[PDB]
């Protein structure tokens, strides 16, 4: 726990050394502020320093239930053999929340907003502009992906 | 000259919301009245004494002008 605490501290330093991840985290924070989607995957450094083994085991015993797990295999794999091995090993993984309190995934409020981290010593500027998307289950994702394919992507490496 | 090369600002983070998501008059009276009272208290002792002495000079000048237009009773004869 302590060695990895140092490891995530170093990796978060290297993550803020990278620049587009900072902008994506800032966009998520300013677009989903006040909701659990504002916080990044790594979490803040003070949380990294203070959370202990008990909190990790509580998270493990809360969010690693059987109905929230998919054993996905691709390639030269037989489905019958995969099913037999899942019955051998992944049978009765947790199946019990131990408190009969299933956590519900509430909607996250999107707010139109703007965050600026001005630091003029940096050589280039990273700007991300987004709006609220439809979600996974909406059929409009295909149309929005078509529009995003029309607009596209570009960098200085391209010889077009 | 234009935006981009005006100042040198580092390590400053700015937070803003949508005008269509925030109120145009957020606590307009319950916070507006104490702020106006505080500003008046801060800048009341620099303007009011000159304006009051203007009022005093105005009244004194009008009064003594009326008294100069008044008849002196020394000329009975």
UniProtKB/Swiss-Prot annotation, chain A:
Name of the molecule in the record: Cytochrome b-c1 complex subunit 1, mitochondrial
Subunit structure: Component of the ubiquinol-cytochrome c oxidoreductase (cytochrome b-c1 complex, complex III, CIII), a multisubunit enzyme composed of 11 subunits. The complex is composed of 3 respiratory subunits cytochrome b, cytochrome c1 and Rieske protein UQCRFS1, 2 core protein subunits UQCRC1/QCR1 and UQCRC2/QCR2, and 6 low-molecular weight protein subunits UQCRH/QCR6, UQCRB/QCR7, UQCRQ/QCR8, UQCR10/QCR9, UQCR11/QCR10 and subunit 9, the cleavage product of Rieske protein UQCRFS1.
Knockout consequences: Results in early embryonic lethality.
Annotated positions of the Phosphoserine modification: 52
Subcellular location: Mitochondrion inner membrane
Domain of life: Eukaryota
Tissue-specificity statement: Expressed in neurons and astrocytes of the cerebral cortex and hippocampus (at protein level).
Positions bearing N6-acetyllysine: 3, 88
Gene from which this protein is expressed: Uqcrc1
GO cellular component, one term: respiratory chain complex III
Main function: Component of the ubiquinol-cytochrome c oxidoreductase, a multisubunit transmembrane complex that is part of the mitochondrial electron transport chain which drives oxidative phosphorylation.
Modified residues (Phosphothreonine): 54
Keywords: Acetylation, Electron transport, Membrane, Mitochondrion, Mitochondrion inner membrane, Phosphoprotein, Respiratory chain, Transit peptide, Transport
Signal sequence range: none
Molecular-function annotations in GO: metal ion binding; protein-containing complex binding; ubiquitin protein ligase binding
Record GO biological process: cellular respiration; mitochondrial electron transport, ubiquinol to cytochrome c; mitochondrial respiratory chain complex III assembly; response to activity; response to alkaloid
Protein family: Belongs to the peptidase M16 family. UQCRC1/QCR1 subfamily.
Residues of the full protein shown: 161 to 320 of 480
From Swiss-Prot, chain B:
Main localization (coarse): mitochondrion
Modified residues (N6-succinyllysine): 31
Subunit comment: Component of the ubiquinol-cytochrome c oxidoreductase (cytochrome b-c1 complex, complex III, CIII), a multisubunit enzyme composed of 11 subunits. The complex is composed of 3 respiratory subunits cytochrome b, cytochrome c1 and Rieske protein UQCRFS1, 2 core protein subunits UQCRC1/QCR1 and UQCRC2/QCR2, and 6 low-molecular weight protein subunits UQCRH/QCR6, UQCRB/QCR7, UQCRQ/QCR8, UQCR10/QCR9, UQCR11/QCR10 and subunit 9, the cleavage product of Rieske protein UQCRFS1.
Keywords: Acetylation, Electron transport, Membrane, Mitochondrion, Mitochondrion inner membrane, Phosphoprotein, Respiratory chain, Transmembrane, Transmembrane helix, Transport
Membrane topology: Single-pass membrane protein
GO biological process, one term: midbrain development
Gene source species: Mus musculus
Family: Belongs to the UQCRQ/QCR8 family.
Protein name (Swiss-Prot/TrEMBL): Cytochrome b-c1 complex subunit 8
Biological role stated in the UniProt entry: Component of the ubiquinol-cytochrome c oxidoreductase, a multisubunit transmembrane complex that is part of the mitochondrial electron transport chain which drives oxidative phosphorylation.
Compartment annotation: Mitochondrion inner membrane
GO cellular component: mitochondrial inner membrane; mitochondrion; respiratory chain complex III
Transmembrane stretches, start-end: 42-60
Membrane topology, Mitochondrial intermembrane segments: 61-77
Residues recorded as bearing N6-acetyllysine in the entry: 31
Mitochondrial matrix domain ranges by topology: 1-41
Modified residues (Phosphoserine): 14
């Amino acid at each position: 726990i302590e060695k990895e605490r140092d490891v995530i501290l170093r990796e978060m330093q290297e993550n803020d050394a990278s620049m587009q991840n900072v902008v994506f985290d800032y966009l998520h924070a300013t677009a989903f502020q006040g909701t659990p989607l504002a916080q990044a995957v790594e979490g803040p450094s003070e949380n990294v320093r203070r959370l202990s083994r008990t909190d990790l085991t509580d998270y493990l015993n809360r969010h690693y239930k059987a109905p929230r797990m998919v054993l996905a295999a691709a390639g030269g794999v037989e489905h019958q053999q995969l099913l037999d091995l899942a019955q051998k090993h992944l049978s009765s993984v947790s199946r019990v929340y131990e408190e009969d309190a299933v956590p519900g995934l509430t909607p996250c409020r999107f707010t139109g907003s703007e965050i600026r981290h001005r630091d003029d010593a940096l050589p280039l500027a990273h700007v991300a502009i987004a709006v609220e998307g439809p979600g996974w289950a909406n059929p409009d994702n295909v149309t929005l992906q078509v529009a995003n394919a029309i607009i596209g992507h570009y960098d200085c490496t391209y010889g077009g | 000259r234009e935006f981009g090369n005006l100042a040198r600002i580092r390590h400053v983070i700015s937070y803003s919301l949508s005008p269509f998501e925030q109120r145009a008059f957020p606590s307009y009276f319950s916070k507006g009245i104490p702020n106006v009272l505080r500003r008046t208290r801060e800048r009341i002792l620099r303007v009011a004494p000159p304006f009051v002495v203007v009022y005093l000079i105005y009244t004194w000048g009008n009064q003594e002008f009326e008294q100069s237009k008044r008849k002196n009773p020394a000329m009975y004869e």
